[PDB]
Design a protein around this ligand. Structure first.
Ligand SMILES: [Zn+2]
Ligand SMILES: [Zn+2]
Ligand SMILES: [Zn+2]
Lengths: 290, 290, 298, 290
């Protein structure tokens, strides 16, 4: 079925994770390519050897990158600047306009293809098929659609200042302006700092690794320098690369046995309040509204 | 050769990684048993694939544990209260008193066992063998030895307020009161938040997971609730486990393919300033004092 | 013969036998008195030959060096051959071997440091046997190289046929400059190293000016032989086990296969940046054709 | 294919690089013979052993030449004086008038051939074959055509005073007036002093060996004396060569091993800007207009 938003890309690369019903509705290949994220899972173990897996993502922004280059999911206002849509294929640009609820851009995309001779020669069929698949996925991920199955069990607040009072701050207000698909992406990628299951409160990370502002979900720590994150044909791209000159064969030989702690930067931000009457363990992806 | 300080425990259990020349000079089994840490490695990757490994430890204290239960490596003042040395074997008490450079307790331990009938034969030899092994390990880890290969190469500060100015805080001056073995343990367990290799500064974690206090190495976050870390045959104990009640097989099957991000809480604290001229990649484990 | 100033390198302690990492080109009597590998290691350069063709095919070949420092390097890292004042700071002599410290302290004529070097080793028991001979052999080889290079030797082959100036403001009038007066402060070996490593902008064989390069790629300053351009950003120059040092490597992500295959048989212009600086007047009665090394003082 | 410009020369010798589609459209022999330049590759490297072949062109003007003898690519105004194109065969003169877009010269050439007895009998088939071939090659090099496969990702400014501000100057203003083929030749031959790929700027040579003025791309250096560059049948030459009378036959043996730095004067002038989106590594000869 290939439940990925960028699956319907054809002239007018999906990873095998698209077939899985994870709820992301995007594959890790496309996630890395577009939103500078790599999907992971957060095994929230119990004291007893029982567990439940919560989706998480690691941002792929380097330490030296600054400014717009640190934005993972831009807002609807500035998604044209971050993504450089004109470089992408017209199908990708149409899908991105749909994802960010840009009706005018979608209309312009449709209009510029009308002047083509072949638009009615099976090209309109392709455009409408891509649009229909993308809109079906969006409606699947949108709680506001007609007769939409929605879950009110989990309250997700991206501002922990007053989260325990069952209310959010400015960050959660900006989160509501997002589309349903982007809200789902941020909910899945950004695992909460605090997960309050019933009365119990669990804290996974000391402080946030990302911030939501007018520029969207930004892969920047709230204070201080940014964390050290180590990471198209016929395109000349030049990147500054940190390199260690020393020989490290003997060090890896000595420290081989011990378990390795990843140097990735997982996306942690906000508060999650799972209600006592929750169905959080279902595997059907009922979209969640805060 | 079992290079574990607690491998000499004998009446008057070491993991296989003790034999490895990791530099901890303590096995993972004994680290878990005594200091509430499990040895790990931190693979520091380039922007290329070349990597070098640093040793870190993940503390095993719970969310609900408060007070002395959160101390990982207690100070010389309060290590008596934290460890409850009476329960463990007298050889273990001798090793601990040698670790904390408490001469009066060592002398009392020697005096108490002098009155036994078997002290002269097959006991004093054992106590002196334990003493010699512990003292050799201490001298290996002590930079103030007669001819010690001390290293001014890496400047490891445990306070980042004035660390960039090559100064230290209160925690750093409290760190110097520790013995050679304890200083080596804290260096090999408490990873640096920042690793300023030459001019380049690499921030490994946004916030510190532990703080050095008057009570010792405390596994307490600087602010907010403590992080969620889920973890004597005849002794009766109560754990108050936080059981998770629900069916998670379906969810675990759904999210199987994706890489698992560990839920462990590692020890990140302080600032490491590696000098331009360094011999970091050696595996000889020279004391490496500040 | 291995006429490399660092070919005398050896571990003073006889327990460790340290072979000299010396390039095969050191045995040549070119006049560098330093091997390619040692000039790559210290005094960051690569020994090159600059063939100055005549108008016809017959040619005479000069020696020049290309500084290996990068674009991003600033401050001390820019200096290739430091001045005698700050050569200790630039080189970090503590990390180097004792033979290297001795050679470098002799190169800059720092007698106090050399006396200190032998004072530190005078205390050990092994100094009397199998180490005094080693230190004296290193000193003798370095002193012989310096004296061969020194124009102030007892009977030196000092040659005034070719005049080499390092300031071009008034070099046509055979007058020196601030950089040249700083150049005279260097010892003989450093002067020859700079002369063989730096080529003039305006060669002036007889009265025939021969401008090698438009603008200088190096400047002699108070800090030393600086690999810094006179103005603007620095030139783009692409470029010890158990040591962990950052690199900041710049990487190209393109395919480059089709572009490389496109231009197959076209002579490749090098990207190397050689040291061009000064004004080497040559007299009508010169003897530049000779192959025997000479100090070549002003 | 013989894509060279003067390949079609018959009455109304190219080095085997005419068949190669390197985008030059003129053989190295024909470049030397016509424009006093040469074909050489400038392999811009990086810290990693990788490269992309950008093309350079040494100029063949000697040290002592003055005035119009130093010009490599004269302007459309004074190409009659600089080139003495009349002396060449009428095919070469016609193709040169084609290159500089002089319709009066071309149709005067046509008028002269009309009165010949052979024009109506198998001569127009030659002159218009030459005209059509050369106009086709020019249009392939000309960016502004009906169907323009132009690339606007890169920007070339031959004036560096305000080049970093994405503007040009007098030199670039006089540069735009050139023909498509002439602009292509100046672009390919003259490598930029500064190559700003994305945000990182690379400087290859300190000073501009060639200066653009009204007389054309002049080999003269902007300051000081000219650089030292050592290099028609039945026409004896009053030619002056340099007198190096030394032996210089064993000194080469003393310096045979080392690598030889070429004494060729390359063609450096101006500042080239490349954006993040670029297709430089393609071999389709994007006309690359400004
Ligand atoms: Zn996909
Ligand atoms: Zn053990
Ligand atoms: Zn050598």
């Amino acid at each position: 079925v290939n439940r990925c938003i960028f699956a319907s890309i054809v002239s007018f690369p999906c990873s095998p994770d698209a077939y899985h019903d994870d709820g992301w509705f995007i594959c890790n290949n496309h996630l890395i390519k577009r939103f500078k994220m790599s999907k992971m899972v957060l095994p929230i173990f119990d004291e007893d050897d029982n567990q439940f897996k919560m989706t998480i993502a690691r941002h792929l922004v380097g330490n030296k990158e600054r400014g717009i280059k640190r934005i993972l999911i831009p807002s609807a206002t500035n998604y044209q600047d971050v993504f450089n849509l004109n470089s992408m294929m017209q199908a990708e640009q149409l899908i991105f306009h749909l994802i960010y609820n840009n009706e005018n851009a979608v209309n312009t995309i449709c209009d510029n293809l009308k002047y083509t001779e072949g638009f009615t020669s099976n090209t309109q069929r392709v455009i409408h098929s891509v649009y229909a698949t993308t809109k079906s996925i969006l409606d699947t991920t949108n709680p506001n659609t007609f007769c939409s199955r929605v879950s009110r069990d989990e309250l997700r607040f991206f501002d922990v200042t007053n989260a325990r009072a069952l209310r959010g701050g400015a960050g959660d207000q900006l989160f509501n302006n997002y589309s349903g698909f982007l809200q789902n992406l941020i909910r899945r990628a950004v695992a909460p700092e605090y997960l309050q299951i019933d009365t119990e409160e669990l804290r996974f990370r000391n402080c946030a690794t990302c911030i939501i502002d007018e520029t969207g979900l930004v892969a920047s720590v709230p204070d201080g320098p940014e964390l050290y994150n180590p990471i198209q044909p016929n395109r000349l791209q030049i990147r500054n690369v940190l390199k260690f000159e020393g020989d490290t064969r003997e060090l890896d030989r000595t420290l081989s046995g011990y378990e390795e702690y990843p140097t990735y930067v997982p996306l942690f931000l906000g508060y999650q309040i799972i209600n006592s009457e929750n169905n959080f363990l279902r595997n059907d992806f009922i979209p969640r509204a805060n």
